[PDB]
Amino acid sequence: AGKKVLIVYAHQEPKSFNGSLKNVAVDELSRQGCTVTVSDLYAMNFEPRATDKDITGTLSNPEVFNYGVETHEAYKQRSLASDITDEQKKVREADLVIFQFPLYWFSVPAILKGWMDRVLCQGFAFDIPGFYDSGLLQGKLALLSVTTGGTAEMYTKTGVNGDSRYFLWPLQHGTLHFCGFKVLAPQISFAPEIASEEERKGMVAAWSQRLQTIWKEEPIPCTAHWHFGQ
Amino acid sequence: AGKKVLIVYAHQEPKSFNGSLKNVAVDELSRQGCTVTVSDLYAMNFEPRATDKDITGTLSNPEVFNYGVETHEAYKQRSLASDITDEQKKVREADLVIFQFPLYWFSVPAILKGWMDRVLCQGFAFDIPGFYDSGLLQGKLALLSVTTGGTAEMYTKTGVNGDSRYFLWPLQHGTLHFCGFKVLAPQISFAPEIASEEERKGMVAAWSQRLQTIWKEEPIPCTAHWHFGQ
Numbered sequence: 001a002g003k004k005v006l007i008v009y010a011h012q013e014p015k016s017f018n019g020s021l022k023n024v025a026v027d028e029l030s031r032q033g034c035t036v037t038v039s040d041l042y043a044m045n046f047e048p049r050a051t052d053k054d055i056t057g058t059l060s061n062p063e064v065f066n067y068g069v070e071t072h073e074a075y076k077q078r079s080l081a082s083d084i085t086d087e088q089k090k091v092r093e094a095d096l097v098i099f100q101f102p103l104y105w106f107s108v109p110a111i112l113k114g115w116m117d118r119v120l121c122q123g124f125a126f127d128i129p130g131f132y133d134s135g136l137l138q139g140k141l142a143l144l145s146v147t148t149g150g151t152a153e154m155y156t157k158t159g160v161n162g163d164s165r166y167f168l169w170p171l172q173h174g175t176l177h178f179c180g181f182k183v184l185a186p187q188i189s190f191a192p193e194i195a196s197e198e199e200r201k202g203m204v205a206a207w208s209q210r211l212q213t214i215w216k217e218e219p220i221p222c223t224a225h226w227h228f229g230q
Numbered sequence: 231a232g233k234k235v236l237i238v239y240a241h242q243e244p245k246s247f248n249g250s251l252k253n254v255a256v257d258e259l260s261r262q263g264c265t266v267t268v269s270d271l272y273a274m275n276f277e278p279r280a281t282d283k284d285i286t287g288t289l290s291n292p293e294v295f296n297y298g299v300e301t302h303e304a305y306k307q308r309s310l311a312s313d314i315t316d317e318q319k320k321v322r323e324a325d326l327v328i329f330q331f332p333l334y335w336f337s338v339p340a341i342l343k344g345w346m347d348r349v350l351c352q353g354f355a356f357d358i359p360g361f362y363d364s365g366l367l368q369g370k371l372a373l374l375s376v377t378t379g380g381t382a383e384m385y386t387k388t389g390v391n392g393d394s395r396y397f398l399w400p401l402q403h404g405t406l407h408f409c410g411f412k413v414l415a416p417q418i419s420f421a422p423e424i425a426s427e428e429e430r431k432g433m434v435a436a437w438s439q440r441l442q443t444i445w446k447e448e449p450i451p452c453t454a455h456w457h458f459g460q
């Protein structure tokens with residue numbers, strides 16, 4: 001009772017399959033009585049580039065620009081750009097962060113990569129200490145809901161693309177785990193464009209139905225063994 | 231027949247360790263008599279977002295925007311935004327493409343992700359069919375020159391980050407190999423921020439040194455086994 005969800009959504013088209021997955025997430029979580037917020041990156045024209053614009057006022061060292069340093073200091077000094085801080089407030093308040101995106105080059109689209117780069121700064125998402133199991137967003141759940149062009153068969157250990165778990169590593173382990181998230185099993189909706197309409201509805205319904213019991217879920221063991229082992 | 235090299239460079243600060251590695255590449259490849267071009271993405275204010283601004287002509291379906299479909303058709307029609315085709319010309323003429331970047335979240339900075347997303351469109355970099363070993367950039371070489379915050383020890387199988395090769399998969403296999411590139415072994419310069427002055431210049435000289443014999447190298451076998459063992 002009282003769970004808060006942030007959906008970070010990265011697709012250009014409301015009528016897309018990604019749009020539909022985001023919308024049933026909103027519908028079903030709202031129905032449950034959850035607090036729901038959506039960051040529609042393309043609609044926000046979210047800035048992906050890590051630049052000195054991300055620090056307002058006076059730079060900690062305006063002769064040699066070091067993004068990591070400058071943003072760490074700016075966070076501690078409440079001097080980050082407001083597009084970034086707006087996102088951090090949403091994340092701070094959320095118990096669950098769902099990312100909804102089409103797979104671009106075995107990864108997130110650049111606009112969402114930019115969100116990760118700029119929003120998850122040191123002092124906010126991680127520090128020394130406080131990473132992996134002890135990262136600063138510990139307590140929070142994160143979940144990747146990804147759509148692919150490639151079929152499930154292509155994403156097997158012997159398929160052309162390798163196991164889908166292989167490309168999850170930088171996202172689930174290198175990013176989410178690192179910051180302290182417990183990582184819920186990814187939702188992977190394989191090749192909607194190729195699948196039939198029965199199959200497509202089946203995937204949307206799978207997602208809607210999964211959302212019904214999302215708060216009862218055990219998070220994966222976010223390990224090398226999980227991603228690459230047998 | 232002499233060689234042409236494109237360096238796609240992604241760092242905000244000319245005096246950075248990445249800047250030094252980039253300039254050493256230019257110096258040494260130039261010294262050899264190679265033709266050298268550098269895409270300095272931050273200096274170019276390179277657009278990372280995949281949006282409908284990337285097509286200028288009549289859309290194939292203006293009611294439901296599909297980025298992949300519209301960019302493929304626009305490539306064939308020659309109605310892609312000019313910043314995209316400017317990059318394509320550089321890649322088309324290159325024998326070797328070197329990517330110089332700091333590791334951001336086990337991956338490329340978003341501005342460089344955007345270059346991959348927007349530049350390597352269907353029809354130019356791959357076709358269906360016409361991918362992986364049949365990719366359209368076959369005959370070309372690619373090399374990732376990466377700098378990390380993490381130490382080499384952290385990037386081992388039993389280290390907290392897992393092996394360094396693990397995070398290369400989406401880039402080397404999912405992107406470069408997919409487009410037909412043969413992939414030269416990565417240059418990873420670990421933890422320059424932690425390093426001593428000597429170790430720093432030693433990492434820069436090691437890269438310069440490698441480049442002296444780059445045209446003698448064979449590519450890696452860009453397979454699951456190379457990346458993950460088993």
Ligand SMILES: Cc1cc2nc3c(=O)[nH]c(=O)nc-3n(C[C@H](O)[C@H](O)[C@H](O)COP(=O)(O)OP(=O)(O)OC[C@H]3O[C@@H](n4cnc5c(N)ncnc54)[C@H](O)[C@@H]3O)c2cc1C
Pocket residue numbers: 011015016017018019020101102103104105106107147148149150151192193197200201204280296297298347348404
């Ligand atoms: C730059 C780029 C890089 C890419 N790299 C990769 C890669 O590395 N690997 C890979 O596998 N793929 C890759 N892709 C392909 C991409 O992942 C897929 O095209 C994308 O995931 C498809 O999702 P979508 O939301 O755009 O589908 P859509 O085309 O928008 O939807 C598919 C169909 O489902 C229909 N639909 C929508 N809503 C519903 C609903 N509620 N119920 C039933 N049907 C519905 C739509 O109308 C549509 O006809 C890449 C694509 C691009 C553009």
Ligand SMILES: Cc1cc2nc3c(=O)[nH]c(=O)nc-3n(C[C@H](O)[C@H](O)[C@H](O)COP(=O)(O)OP(=O)(O)OC[C@H]3O[C@@H](n4cnc5c(N)ncnc54)[C@H](O)[C@@H]3O)c2cc1C
Pocket residue numbers: 066067068117118174241245246247248249250331332333334335336337377378379380381422423427430431434
């Ligand atoms: C958003 C973000 C996400 C990140 N995610 C990760 C991650 O997932 N994993 C990870 O391991 N790291 C990560 N990092 C860390 C990042 O990879 C490192 O900070 C970066 O790789 C260091 O490279 P640099 O060029 O900025 O180093 P610099 O700070 O520019 O270089 C270090 C030192 O080298 C000196 N130097 C420059 N040129 C020379 C020279 N020619 N000779 C000697 N010394 C020289 C510089 O003056 C400086 O003092 C992340 C950083 C950011 C900002």
Ligand SMILES: CN(C)c1nc2c(Br)c(Br)c(Br)c(Br)c2[nH]1
Pocket residue numbers: 105149150193296297298299350351352
């Ligand atoms: C639009 N569409 C059907 C589409 N675009 C794709 C791109 Br770009 C890549 Br890269 C891959 Br891999 C696949 Br599969 C794609 N499918």
Ligand SMILES: CN(C)c1nc2c(Br)c(Br)c(Br)c(Br)c2[nH]1
Pocket residue numbers: 068069121122335378379380423
């Ligand atoms: C600036 N600096 C030294 C720095 N910034 C880092 C970031 Br951001 C991440 Br995420 C990681 Br992981 C490491 Br290691 C980093 N080291």
Ligand SMILES: [Zn+2]
Pocket residue numbers: 172173174177178221222223224
């Ligand atoms: Zn993990």
Ligand SMILES: [Zn+2]
Pocket residue numbers: 402403404407408451452453
């Ligand atoms: Zn490969």
